[PDB]
Amino acid sequence: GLATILAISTATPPNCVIQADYPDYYFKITNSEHMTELKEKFRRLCEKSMIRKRHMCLTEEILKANPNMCLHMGTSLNARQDISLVEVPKLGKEAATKAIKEWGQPKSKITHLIFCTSAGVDMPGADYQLTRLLGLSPEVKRMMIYQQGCYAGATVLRLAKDLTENNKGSRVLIVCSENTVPTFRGPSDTHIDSLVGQALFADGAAALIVGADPDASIERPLYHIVSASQTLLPDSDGAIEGHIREAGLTVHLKKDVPAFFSANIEKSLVDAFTPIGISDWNSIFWIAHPGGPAILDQVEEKLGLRKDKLKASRHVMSEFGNMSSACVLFILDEMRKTCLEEGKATTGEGLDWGVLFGFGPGLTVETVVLRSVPI
Amino acid sequence: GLATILAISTATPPNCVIQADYPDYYFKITNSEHMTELKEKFRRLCEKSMIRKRHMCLTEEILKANPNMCLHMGTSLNARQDISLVEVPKLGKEAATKAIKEWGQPKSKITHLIFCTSAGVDMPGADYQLTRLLGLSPEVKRMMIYQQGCYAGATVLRLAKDLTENNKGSRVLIVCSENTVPTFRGPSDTHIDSLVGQALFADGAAALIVGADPDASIERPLYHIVSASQTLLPDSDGAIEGHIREAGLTVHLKKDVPAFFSANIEKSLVDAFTPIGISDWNSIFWIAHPGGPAILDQVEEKLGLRKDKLKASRHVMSEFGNMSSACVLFILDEMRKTCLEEGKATTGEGLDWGVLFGFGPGLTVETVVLRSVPI
């Protein structure tokens, strides 16, 4: 067969933050109102993010209950773990139940589970928690993908393709669940790159069903996963790092990040699409992890993409912020729903071939070649 | 093709502790010599461990510099991470270099990397570090398996099987690297289960090359990975837990653990060997994760295994202790070397079919069916 996405669903915590209001709220709750210049910098970061709103399980009440999380470097990993380790599989279950209901088959037919998160590690992991919460078969074959950051929404597709194509009749449930509990922290003039995360990161979960031999009388293909590649970018060592410490997950970013991704992305397109015979990057549909807005702007400019190629990707970023691995799965869901509602000829904006990109630490570009499905 | 192990190598840190001396050493370096009854309990645990020696990168000198690690619950994750995150890929590279040398092919033919550890998470992960240290191709397809504990030496074989068999010509490098840095801590009267870990856990790394289409002119099969299953045991929730906290990785064990594994292991054997037609568990060769010695004793008793079926597994436990995911890979290396030197007819103690078991949190039994290779 050929790995095929059969259902997609998403979930977010009910609490949302309006990005226009976030600088005042953030500098107040972190006791940082004396940092007037830094607050103006943060306002500019929030304005430039092109995020309208973000969902966050971290409410004002929870932050007031956890003052060490509101320090810049407060000893707080235990408080963060206590919140996030429950929230990650809970939000994952919400998305998974909806995807399983869309699919419409018995959960006993789920043979594999891939769980992905960077919001907190535990033994047994979130894959175990989700298996028990859902009532999956105890013999479900689990793969727990921890702490791989913003490219792992593509990673899980790369993994799912090999799992489903090498196991006749297998059905893989994929769940990505991300949140800001590990990364939220007070500001510091010494650490501007942390501020970037505070402007961008958000909560969300997405779930998919994948199989390589869809039964046309009961299942409905949405996308086919044709190929999946991964590469490290030259000379990019150390550009993005995240450390799990006593103060939570600390983020470290170098100024050069968008230039690294935009200068190297065409190589990934050439390598992925030369065997297909496609070289017109405007003739394919696009899903690009959008959590770095300058990355997409510079990729668009470097490649000469028409300004609407990234519309679905930028829409998810506007309405949800950087939900890490879940973003590209939300974008797939946005695209297939918008294409159905608008009467497009395919789930890929009327086009047959598409590309899905994950970007993250390494640097690392994950490149997935997709095919759409008619109407 | 069919996933085939083509090379195996191992590595350990040079420092080792003799188990007969460890109760005195451990109770001195943790400033706990007044706890005489607890020390006697620890002596009995160390004696019943059937471990002769363990390798550990944690030295007396390093422990003296990290007093927070010597308390039972001292704030110490940062100090642990600082040691472990460099040691994990360093020891992994040592094993990987040896395995690639045995294999004898250029490192540029490695298309995939699986890295597995529970000794500390970082972004980018140990897979990235190993890629750069080894000079693997930037386009190597990486899978980072973090925090899955003592069954993950079987997990990586399950993963490698699907990766190699779905990608023609692919060659996967597997590296498992474990250490005691996150778990070492001082003793406590009300946490005897943590004391168990202090008697058992050890450092080590193993590396393998796997491919599904071995070229007999240049490559040398050692074992074939025929099937790979995973299951959760009934009624076992919470029997083993490990939490990543400000004090490091804390371990929590209920008393019933060996009985859970021994009561349920025959179901896994029947499920795995029914398509092959085997029911005599003495007629297959055995690789069993040995880090819980009572588990192997009860499995041996329950199934009626003859007294030397578990010899290779217990030998690795005796000479190296519980190195978590790396143990079963050490046992595979020990078995194929012993069989070569004893003039056995196959790499599986003269037998054709074998079973490899990982045991870990969940509970979770991973069951891998192997075939040996002749002489």
XYZ file of C-alpha atoms in Angstrom:
750
model
C 0.000 0.000 0.000
C 0.834 3.673 0.513
C 0.438 5.573 3.787
C -2.767 7.593 3.718
C -4.229 10.047 6.227
C -7.823 8.976 6.935
C -8.933 11.413 9.658
C -7.666 14.566 11.388
C -8.838 16.438 14.449
C -7.561 19.120 16.798
C -8.113 20.447 20.308
C -7.100 23.512 22.323
C -7.505 24.554 25.959
C -10.498 26.861 26.389
C -8.493 29.754 27.872
C -7.243 32.079 25.142
C -5.038 35.183 25.268
C -5.498 38.081 22.848
C -2.075 38.933 21.448
C -2.793 42.673 21.420
C -3.335 42.502 25.198
C -0.474 40.155 26.006
C 2.449 42.586 26.614
C 0.597 44.419 29.403
C -0.591 41.144 30.947
C 2.802 39.439 30.693
C 4.858 42.267 32.169
C 2.322 42.628 34.997
C 2.055 38.937 35.977
C 5.857 38.553 35.969
C 6.444 41.669 38.161
C 8.403 43.318 35.387
C 6.742 46.696 35.015
C 10.036 48.580 35.613
C 11.517 47.103 32.398
C 9.930 49.750 30.194
C 12.312 49.440 27.253
C 12.096 45.656 27.260
C 8.292 45.869 27.363
C 8.290 48.049 24.249
C 10.577 45.509 22.545
C 8.132 42.766 23.528
C 5.216 44.775 22.130
C 7.058 45.005 18.814
C 7.716 41.258 18.913
C 4.049 40.553 19.573
C 2.952 42.918 16.792
C 5.398 41.363 14.312
C 4.365 37.806 15.218
C 1.130 38.165 13.192
C -0.581 36.092 15.892
C -4.108 37.201 16.787
C -4.721 34.808 19.681
C -3.236 31.806 21.479
C -4.771 29.124 23.675
C -2.995 28.400 26.961
C -3.835 26.064 29.800
C -1.682 28.410 31.920
C -4.252 30.845 33.288
C -3.736 33.881 35.488
C -5.005 31.862 38.464
C -2.486 29.079 37.839
C 0.356 31.567 37.426
C -0.615 33.353 40.646
C -0.509 29.923 42.320
C 3.001 29.278 40.911
C 5.126 32.390 41.496
C 8.391 30.589 40.723
C 7.146 30.086 37.145
C 6.751 33.866 36.873
C 10.382 34.469 37.767
C 12.863 34.452 34.921
C 14.831 31.491 36.341
C 12.838 30.281 39.330
C 13.207 26.710 40.550
C 9.985 25.431 39.038
C 10.431 22.200 37.054
C 8.374 20.214 39.578
C 5.471 22.688 39.424
C 5.644 22.659 35.634
C 5.719 18.848 35.458
C 2.754 18.577 37.824
C 0.651 20.726 35.465
C 1.882 19.582 32.077
C 2.091 15.794 32.528
C -1.668 15.633 33.086
C -2.554 18.258 30.488
C -0.570 16.685 27.628
C -2.483 13.359 27.401
C -5.762 15.047 28.402
C -5.657 17.432 25.437
C -4.349 14.584 23.307
C -7.347 12.454 24.252
C -9.712 15.251 23.264
C -8.185 15.426 19.776
C -7.857 11.634 19.427
C -11.479 10.886 20.301
C -12.674 13.246 17.579
C -10.309 11.778 14.983
C -11.363 8.234 15.926
C -15.035 9.221 15.609
C -14.437 10.831 12.193
C -12.667 7.647 11.070
C -15.626 5.685 12.406
C -13.924 2.329 12.974
C -13.594 0.472 16.292
C -10.669 1.579 18.423
C -9.744 -2.123 18.623
C -8.539 -1.742 15.004
C -5.844 0.729 16.081
C -2.637 -1.318 15.932
C -0.047 1.432 16.508
C 0.156 4.664 18.503
C 2.644 7.488 17.925
C 2.617 10.149 20.646
C 4.675 13.324 20.273
C 5.292 16.085 22.796
C 7.970 18.475 24.000
C 5.965 19.626 27.045
C 7.257 17.164 29.624
C 8.713 13.676 29.995
C 7.546 10.916 32.354
C 7.830 7.136 32.763
C 5.599 5.595 31.595
C 5.083 8.296 29.009
C 2.174 10.154 27.513
C 1.671 7.274 25.057
C 0.826 4.996 27.973
C -1.496 7.574 29.533
C -3.320 8.063 26.223
C -3.633 4.300 25.672
C -5.323 3.904 29.044
C -7.499 7.046 28.719
C -8.790 5.879 25.308
C -9.076 2.181 26.081
C -6.863 1.083 23.228
C -5.831 -2.536 22.991
C -3.030 -3.356 25.457
C -1.118 -4.804 22.467
C -1.055 -1.441 20.678
C 2.489 -0.855 19.382
C 3.617 2.470 20.832
C 6.310 4.923 19.786
C 6.857 7.849 22.140
C 8.521 10.833 20.430
C 9.742 13.169 23.191
C 11.335 16.608 23.044
C 11.968 16.884 19.296
C 10.526 20.369 19.083
C 8.974 22.115 16.143
C 9.813 19.690 13.314
C 8.225 16.626 14.926
C 4.845 17.092 13.251
C 6.657 16.008 10.107
C 8.699 13.385 11.987
C 5.511 11.589 13.070
C 4.400 11.398 9.431
C 7.796 9.994 8.415
C 7.508 7.369 11.166
C 3.859 6.568 10.393
C 4.678 5.955 6.730
C 7.137 3.182 7.555
C 4.924 1.672 10.273
C 1.789 1.455 8.118
C 3.497 0.360 4.892
C 5.448 -2.460 6.524
C 2.506 -3.903 8.487
C -0.422 -5.134 6.420
C -3.730 -3.767 7.692
C -2.157 -1.614 10.393
C -3.869 1.573 11.523
C -1.703 4.168 13.296
C -3.119 6.770 15.657
C -0.842 9.829 15.783
C -1.224 12.374 18.581
C 0.814 15.577 18.984
C 0.137 17.618 22.124
C 2.066 20.742 23.056
C 1.774 23.551 25.602
C 3.644 26.501 27.127
C 3.915 25.156 30.695
C 7.631 24.234 30.401
C 8.692 27.454 28.672
C 6.678 30.256 30.308
C 8.910 32.482 32.410
C 9.581 36.076 33.391
C 11.617 38.383 31.152
C 15.316 39.238 31.294
C 17.253 41.971 29.468
C 20.117 39.462 29.114
C 17.907 36.934 27.263
C 15.955 38.542 24.400
C 15.594 35.202 22.644
C 13.487 33.910 25.527
C 11.119 36.814 24.835
C 10.572 35.469 21.316
C 9.201 32.236 22.744
C 6.956 34.166 25.124
C 5.480 35.966 22.100
C 4.995 32.834 19.974
C 4.511 29.560 21.834
C 0.984 28.244 22.381
C -1.038 25.138 23.325
C -2.688 22.642 21.013
C -3.164 19.001 20.158
C -3.810 17.221 16.884
C -4.624 13.622 16.054
C -4.611 11.606 12.831
C -5.439 8.090 11.668
C -3.082 6.672 9.012
C -3.295 3.426 7.060
C -1.624 2.089 3.941
C -4.553 0.017 2.567
C -7.696 2.140 3.001
C -11.006 0.310 2.516
C -13.007 2.563 0.196
C -16.351 1.378 1.573
C -15.557 2.534 5.131
C -12.577 4.927 4.977
C -11.995 8.269 3.253
C -8.482 9.298 2.163
C -7.432 12.907 2.711
C -3.704 12.921 1.892
C -1.120 10.382 0.805
C 2.360 10.444 2.377
C 4.592 9.830 -0.649
C 8.105 10.419 0.752
C 9.752 11.793 3.884
C 13.288 13.144 4.300
C 15.275 14.863 7.052
C 18.432 16.959 6.877
C 20.695 19.062 9.091
C 21.583 22.479 7.743
C 25.249 23.296 7.098
C 27.043 25.558 9.586
C 23.898 25.884 11.703
C 25.163 24.182 14.884
C 23.761 25.812 18.011
C 21.277 28.083 16.237
C 18.352 26.743 18.305
C 18.796 24.987 21.628
C 16.370 24.044 24.362
C 17.557 22.854 27.768
C 15.541 21.006 30.388
C 16.696 22.544 33.689
C 15.514 23.188 37.251
C 13.820 26.367 35.954
C 11.933 24.475 33.227
C 12.640 24.450 29.499
C 14.926 27.329 28.550
C 15.102 28.433 24.908
C 18.196 29.824 23.180
C 17.994 31.339 19.703
C 20.540 32.918 17.381
C 19.719 35.882 15.159
C 20.575 33.944 11.984
C 17.744 31.369 12.192
C 15.423 32.524 9.348
C 18.412 33.076 7.060
C 19.606 29.514 7.661
C 16.239 27.984 6.750
C 15.565 30.208 3.742
C 19.089 29.783 2.324
C 18.921 25.986 2.445
C 15.274 25.087 1.840
C 15.521 24.900 -1.952
C 17.964 21.984 -1.649
C 15.297 20.028 0.220
C 12.751 20.799 -2.517
C 15.159 19.776 -5.285
C 16.032 16.529 -3.518
C 12.394 15.672 -2.805
C 10.826 16.621 -6.130
C 13.475 15.810 -8.742
C 12.415 12.098 -8.717
C 8.834 13.325 -9.261
C 9.762 15.629 -12.144
C 8.384 18.774 -10.457
C 10.402 21.977 -10.245
C 7.710 24.698 -10.099
C 7.278 25.378 -6.387
C 4.079 27.336 -7.063
C 2.503 24.258 -8.711
C 2.363 22.265 -5.448
C 0.395 22.939 -2.297
C 2.283 24.011 0.843
C 2.150 23.158 4.533
C 4.987 24.905 6.347
C 5.538 25.013 10.071
C 4.738 28.693 10.686
C 5.945 29.216 14.230
C 8.768 31.439 13.005
C 7.115 34.184 10.941
C 10.368 35.540 9.493
C 11.220 32.005 8.364
C 8.122 31.866 6.161
C 8.612 35.417 4.888
C 12.196 34.683 3.860
C 11.365 31.276 2.367
C 8.573 32.885 0.335
C 10.929 35.609 -0.904
C 13.893 33.305 -1.564
C 11.824 30.820 -3.593
C 9.589 33.318 -5.394
C 6.429 31.785 -3.951
C 3.200 33.552 -4.764
C 1.913 35.336 -1.676
C -1.051 32.964 -1.132
C 0.893 29.670 -1.163
C 1.367 29.892 2.611
C -2.160 31.141 3.367
C -3.340 28.088 5.313
C -0.076 27.968 7.273
C -0.229 31.647 8.182
C -3.927 31.355 9.080
C -3.242 28.672 11.679
C -0.412 30.808 13.068
C -2.747 33.810 13.266
C -5.508 31.910 15.089
C -3.394 29.636 17.308
C 0.226 30.728 17.524
C 3.218 28.390 17.541
C 1.870 25.068 18.862
C 5.164 23.312 17.993
C 4.665 19.847 16.420
C 0.888 20.242 16.226
C 0.963 23.227 13.798
C 1.402 21.345 10.535
C -1.377 18.922 11.486
C -3.719 21.854 12.203
C -2.714 23.245 8.807
C -3.559 19.966 7.079
C -6.949 20.055 8.810
C -7.515 23.709 7.852
C -6.607 22.985 4.228
C -8.863 19.976 3.694
C -11.818 21.667 5.404
C -11.386 24.946 3.507
C -10.993 23.072 0.222
C -14.230 21.144 0.846
C -16.164 24.262 1.816
C -14.896 26.227 -1.187
C -15.460 23.419 -3.695
C -11.822 23.043 -4.710
C -10.936 20.091 -6.921
C -8.628 18.466 -4.332
C -7.746 18.599 -0.642
C -4.530 20.349 -1.727
C -6.094 23.603 -2.947
C -6.911 22.021 -6.303
C -3.328 20.838 -6.836
C -2.162 17.232 -6.942
C 1.261 17.322 -5.262
C 2.235 19.072 -2.059
C 5.023 19.567 0.439
C 4.959 19.639 4.239
C 7.898 21.164 6.137
C 8.964 20.833 9.758
C 11.652 23.209 11.075
C 13.473 22.872 14.374
C 16.649 22.330 16.395
C 19.734 21.080 14.596
C 18.913 23.028 12.619
C 16.898 20.164 10.811
C 14.393 20.472 8.025
C 11.896 17.626 7.671
C 10.466 17.432 4.129
C 7.332 15.359 3.450
C 5.991 14.959 -0.084
C 2.193 14.652 -0.143
C -0.472 13.919 -2.687
C -3.937 15.351 -2.327
C -7.194 13.433 -2.900
C -9.936 14.510 -5.363
C -12.861 16.563 -3.957
C 14.004 -8.031 2.551
C 14.173 -8.938 6.225
C 15.780 -6.796 8.934
C 19.165 -8.345 9.758
C 21.713 -7.374 12.410
C 25.096 -6.977 10.661
C 27.351 -5.716 13.508
C 27.187 -5.182 17.279
C 29.594 -3.417 19.597
C 29.563 -2.161 23.163
C 31.260 0.408 25.370
C 31.514 1.169 29.085
C 33.135 3.980 31.057
C 36.511 2.958 32.490
C 35.567 3.472 36.149
C 33.884 0.509 37.762
C 32.647 -0.422 41.210
C 32.919 -3.922 42.657
C 29.531 -4.871 44.051
C 30.974 -6.596 47.130
C 32.415 -3.229 48.174
C 29.559 -1.025 47.094
C 27.456 -0.913 50.322
C 30.403 0.489 52.264
C 31.249 2.959 49.496
C 27.663 4.082 48.865
C 26.798 4.630 52.508
C 29.988 6.613 53.068
C 29.744 8.906 50.023
C 26.078 9.633 50.836
C 26.919 10.423 54.503
C 24.498 7.744 55.712
C 26.702 5.478 57.838
C 24.545 6.075 60.937
C 21.653 4.261 59.154
C 22.909 0.820 60.112
C 19.705 -1.174 59.583
C 19.210 0.430 56.167
C 22.816 -0.343 55.277
C 22.306 -4.009 56.134
C 19.200 -4.023 53.920
C 21.264 -2.503 51.098
C 23.973 -5.124 51.613
C 21.356 -7.844 51.168
C 20.010 -6.140 48.041
C 23.514 -5.941 46.584
C 24.237 -9.572 47.457
C 20.978 -10.793 45.911
C 21.554 -8.677 42.774
C 23.955 -11.303 41.353
C 26.000 -8.367 40.010
C 29.767 -8.673 40.300
C 30.694 -5.227 38.984
C 29.203 -2.170 37.304
C 30.734 0.608 35.247
C 29.870 4.174 36.235
C 31.064 7.514 34.932
C 30.155 8.980 38.357
C 33.392 8.950 40.365
C 33.997 9.591 44.032
C 35.595 12.867 42.995
C 32.601 13.951 40.933
C 30.174 12.985 43.715
C 32.169 15.020 46.258
C 31.821 18.036 43.940
C 28.032 17.472 43.764
C 26.719 17.116 47.331
C 23.162 17.794 46.158
C 23.348 14.525 44.216
C 24.288 12.655 47.410
C 21.179 13.694 49.318
C 18.077 11.616 48.820
C 16.097 14.523 47.318
C 18.554 17.352 46.716
C 17.985 19.976 44.043
C 20.355 18.481 41.495
C 18.895 18.155 37.966
C 21.121 20.877 36.518
C 24.269 19.181 37.826
C 23.062 15.797 36.560
C 22.207 17.173 33.115
C 25.599 18.866 32.889
C 27.348 15.504 33.345
C 24.967 13.177 31.535
C 24.244 15.116 28.350
C 27.878 14.964 27.256
C 28.492 11.402 28.513
C 25.516 9.856 26.661
C 26.695 10.661 23.098
C 30.369 10.240 24.066
C 29.857 6.639 25.158
C 27.459 6.084 22.258
C 30.074 7.294 19.765
C 32.608 4.873 21.243
C 30.254 1.940 20.638
C 29.105 3.254 17.246
C 32.646 3.620 15.946
C 33.371 0.005 16.885
C 30.196 -1.279 15.215
C 30.859 0.652 12.008
C 34.405 -0.745 11.934
C 33.073 -4.305 12.326
C 30.527 -3.684 9.590
C 33.300 -2.413 7.340
C 31.271 -0.128 5.060
C 31.729 3.639 4.729
C 29.721 5.704 7.202
C 28.169 7.550 4.245
C 26.026 4.449 3.579
C 24.263 4.870 6.934
C 20.836 6.222 5.937
C 19.072 6.122 9.316
C 20.043 6.627 12.966
C 18.060 5.474 16.007
C 19.359 6.866 19.310
C 17.914 5.648 22.609
C 18.551 6.916 26.138
C 16.777 7.558 29.423
C 19.755 9.412 30.937
C 18.851 12.958 29.991
C 16.926 14.971 27.428
C 18.205 17.951 25.437
C 17.259 19.879 22.294
C 18.706 19.013 19.805
C 19.036 15.493 21.172
C 21.757 12.886 21.502
C 20.930 11.736 17.962
C 22.120 15.117 16.677
C 25.230 15.038 18.866
C 26.124 11.547 17.653
C 25.565 12.564 14.018
C 28.010 15.440 14.311
C 30.572 13.490 16.394
C 30.562 10.626 13.888
C 30.405 12.723 10.741
C 27.316 10.951 9.450
C 25.609 12.386 6.401
C 23.527 15.495 7.197
C 20.599 13.749 5.510
C 20.639 10.763 7.871
C 17.046 10.063 8.914
C 17.065 10.220 12.713
C 14.686 8.848 15.356
C 15.354 9.867 18.966
C 13.806 7.482 21.543
C 13.945 9.267 24.919
C 12.947 8.111 28.410
C 11.442 4.722 27.534
C 13.450 2.846 30.143
C 14.427 -0.798 30.271
C 12.316 -2.193 27.434
C 13.650 0.199 24.810
C 16.488 -2.093 23.703
C 13.694 -4.167 22.214
C 11.828 -1.057 21.021
C 14.746 0.043 18.857
C 14.778 -3.354 17.133
C 11.039 -3.077 16.493
C 11.604 0.366 14.999
C 14.660 -0.703 12.964
C 12.671 -3.581 11.419
C 10.062 -1.259 9.902
C 12.635 1.353 8.828
C 14.913 -1.119 7.032
C 12.209 -3.205 5.432
C 10.282 -0.261 4.005
C 13.361 1.520 2.552
C 15.310 -0.434 -0.045
C 19.033 -0.435 0.644
C 18.744 1.447 3.912
C 21.238 0.846 6.697
C 20.237 1.850 10.223
C 22.718 2.628 12.978
C 21.127 1.939 16.392
C 22.774 3.401 19.496
C 21.613 2.836 23.089
C 23.502 4.780 25.771
C 22.586 4.707 29.477
C 24.100 5.811 32.781
C 23.361 6.286 36.479
C 23.769 10.074 36.558
C 20.027 10.935 36.705
C 19.198 8.248 39.274
C 22.094 8.197 41.748
C 20.939 9.519 45.119
C 21.276 9.024 48.856
C 19.229 6.484 50.808
C 15.947 6.912 52.669
C 14.189 4.566 55.129
C 10.783 5.064 53.484
C 12.051 4.660 49.889
C 13.488 1.141 49.735
C 12.480 0.989 46.077
C 14.994 3.727 45.293
C 17.549 1.625 47.160
C 16.865 -1.209 44.700
C 17.890 1.047 41.821
C 21.082 2.019 43.626
C 21.995 -1.669 43.779
C 21.224 -2.405 40.098
C 21.671 0.515 37.687
C 24.864 0.853 35.638
C 26.418 2.595 32.628
C 26.901 1.268 29.140
C 26.305 1.767 25.455
C 25.689 -0.580 22.557
C 25.503 0.003 18.835
C 24.179 -2.076 15.936
C 23.996 -1.918 12.155
C 20.779 -3.289 10.643
C 19.776 -3.769 7.017
C 17.082 -5.727 5.239
C 19.043 -6.645 2.073
C 22.472 -7.805 3.285
C 25.118 -8.257 0.598
C 26.745 -11.595 1.427
C 29.916 -10.554 -0.429
C 30.644 -7.708 2.016
C 28.286 -8.038 4.997
C 27.900 -10.716 7.660
C 24.460 -11.463 9.150
C 24.287 -12.219 12.869
C 20.529 -12.323 13.619
C 17.295 -11.759 11.725
C 14.508 -9.699 13.325
C 11.429 -11.752 12.395
C 8.684 -10.016 14.369
C 8.278 -7.454 17.156
C 5.338 -7.003 19.547
C 4.570 -4.799 22.517
C 1.973 -5.177 25.239
C 0.813 -3.695 28.538
C 0.201 -6.081 31.365
C -3.257 -6.334 32.947
C -3.798 -4.710 36.349
C -0.212 -3.413 36.425
C -0.812 0.379 36.333
C 1.696 2.260 38.466
C 3.870 -0.762 39.247
C 6.996 1.028 37.906
C 7.251 4.799 37.574
C 10.127 7.168 36.961
C 9.717 10.923 37.384
C 12.017 13.627 36.037
C 12.154 16.174 38.868
C 14.323 18.878 40.369
C 16.150 16.097 42.251
C 16.749 14.072 39.102
C 15.098 10.868 37.968
C 13.230 9.337 40.898
C 12.259 5.663 40.733
C 9.153 4.089 42.268
C 8.585 0.338 42.378
C 5.767 -1.734 43.816
C 6.457 -5.102 45.432
C 4.499 -7.222 42.931
C 6.675 -6.464 39.888
C 8.366 -9.855 39.227
C 5.042 -11.658 39.610
C 3.407 -9.418 36.999
C 6.039 -10.267 34.400
C 6.236 -13.987 35.168
C 2.432 -14.425 35.280
C 2.057 -12.841 31.847
C 5.152 -13.779 29.838
C 3.760 -17.011 28.405
C 0.923 -15.130 26.696
C 3.558 -13.080 24.886
C 5.415 -16.269 23.910
C 2.298 -17.954 22.563
C 1.245 -14.833 20.642
C 4.702 -14.510 19.068
C 5.408 -18.167 18.294
C 2.002 -19.405 17.115
C 2.750 -18.418 13.449
C 6.036 -20.326 13.750
C 4.649 -23.441 15.429
C 6.879 -23.521 18.516
C 5.635 -24.366 21.997
C 8.742 -25.792 23.715
C 10.356 -22.768 25.330
C 13.592 -24.704 25.866
C 13.915 -25.189 22.081
C 14.533 -21.465 21.345
C 17.410 -19.264 22.418
C 16.779 -16.533 24.991
C 17.778 -12.880 25.384
C 15.954 -11.530 28.406
C 16.468 -8.105 29.917
C 18.092 -9.098 33.251
C 17.996 -5.851 35.227
C 15.432 -7.329 37.602
C 16.945 -10.637 38.731
C 13.793 -11.890 40.457
C 11.984 -11.396 37.134
C 14.289 -13.890 35.404
C 14.178 -16.310 38.338
C 10.373 -16.364 38.287
C 10.179 -16.604 34.496
C 12.627 -19.501 34.575
C 10.613 -21.264 37.281
C 7.209 -20.550 35.696
C 8.166 -21.777 32.215
C 10.436 -24.623 33.300
C 13.474 -23.243 31.510
C 16.554 -25.415 31.876
C 19.277 -23.968 34.055
C 21.490 -22.533 31.290
C 18.854 -21.026 28.971
C 19.391 -17.615 30.577
C 23.191 -17.947 30.889
C 24.093 -15.174 28.428
C 21.538 -12.833 29.993
C 22.765 -13.471 33.544
C 26.401 -13.168 32.465
C 25.814 -9.626 31.204
C 23.981 -8.770 34.419
C 26.897 -10.184 36.434
C 29.642 -8.307 34.589
C 27.791 -5.049 33.910
C 24.652 -4.626 36.025
C 21.402 -3.129 34.749
C 22.370 -0.828 31.865
C 18.683 -0.351 30.949
C 18.096 -0.453 27.149
C 21.666 -1.479 26.375
C 21.461 -4.831 28.242
C 19.725 -6.917 25.603
C 22.162 -5.600 23.001
C 25.129 -6.568 25.187
C 23.524 -10.002 25.537
C 23.213 -10.387 21.750
C 26.894 -9.509 21.380
C 27.840 -11.919 24.200
C 25.791 -14.705 22.643
C 27.182 -14.473 19.112
C 30.760 -14.248 20.418
C 30.298 -17.196 22.794
C 28.717 -19.288 20.037
C 31.575 -18.554 17.654
C 34.154 -19.514 20.277
C 32.325 -22.652 21.499
C 31.878 -23.952 17.941
C 28.080 -23.789 18.090
C 26.158 -24.405 14.874
C 24.375 -21.006 14.948
C 24.632 -17.614 16.633
C 21.707 -18.710 18.772
C 23.417 -21.386 20.852
C 22.990 -23.861 18.013
C 19.243 -23.193 17.814
C 17.301 -21.610 14.962
C 14.614 -19.502 16.665
C 15.068 -17.107 19.560
C 13.203 -14.597 21.668
C 14.341 -11.217 22.956
C 12.404 -9.562 25.789
C 12.386 -5.987 27.055
C 10.658 -5.254 30.385
C 9.795 -1.788 31.641
C 7.297 0.849 32.769
C 3.650 0.314 31.941
C 4.266 -2.394 32.836
C 5.118 -3.287 29.085
C 6.713 -6.367 27.671
C 8.421 -6.035 24.288
C 8.720 -9.410 22.491
C 11.081 -9.736 19.522
C 11.300 -13.027 17.614
C 14.789 -13.619 16.216
C 16.339 -16.146 13.888
C 19.961 -17.072 14.314
C 22.466 -17.423 11.462
C 24.593 -20.551 10.829
C 28.282 -20.604 11.846
